[PDB]
Amino acid sequence: FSRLDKVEAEVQIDRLITGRLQSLQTYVTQQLIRAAEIRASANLAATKM
Amino acid sequence: FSRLDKVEAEVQIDRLITGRLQSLQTYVTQQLIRAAEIRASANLAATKM
């Protein structure tokens, strides 16, 4: 921001934020899969209890 | 690489690489879902066994 013009730095910061949102979305999806697996294991543990 | 200079072609190759990684991660996510389903079916098969 302090080195480039706003319209020129807009493309670079757009690339950066697209990468960061992609990484965050992948993390959220992996967390959801792990949560589903833990939910199934908890149901099995509840049946055992 | 042999047609355009290295000060403008990076955008096009960046778009291509990002698209290919997107397709690869979609394949990985589908594989994870099928793995979870096969794991549940295999646990049921073990219980029947």
Swiss-Prot record, chains A, B:
Domain of life: Viruses
Job of this protein: Subunit of the fusion protein that is processed upon entry into the host cell. Mediates fusion of the virion and cellular membranes by functioning as a class I viral fusion protein. Contains a viral fusion peptide that is unmasked after S2 cleavage. This cleavage can occur at the cell membrane by host TMPRSS2 or during endocytosis by host CSTL. In either case, this triggers an extensive and irreversible conformational change that leads to fusion of the viral envelope with the cellular cytoplasmic membrane, releasing viral genomic RNA into the host cell cytoplasm.
Protein name from the UniProt record: Spike protein S2'
Organism: Severe acute respiratory syndrome coronavirus 2 (2019-nCoV)
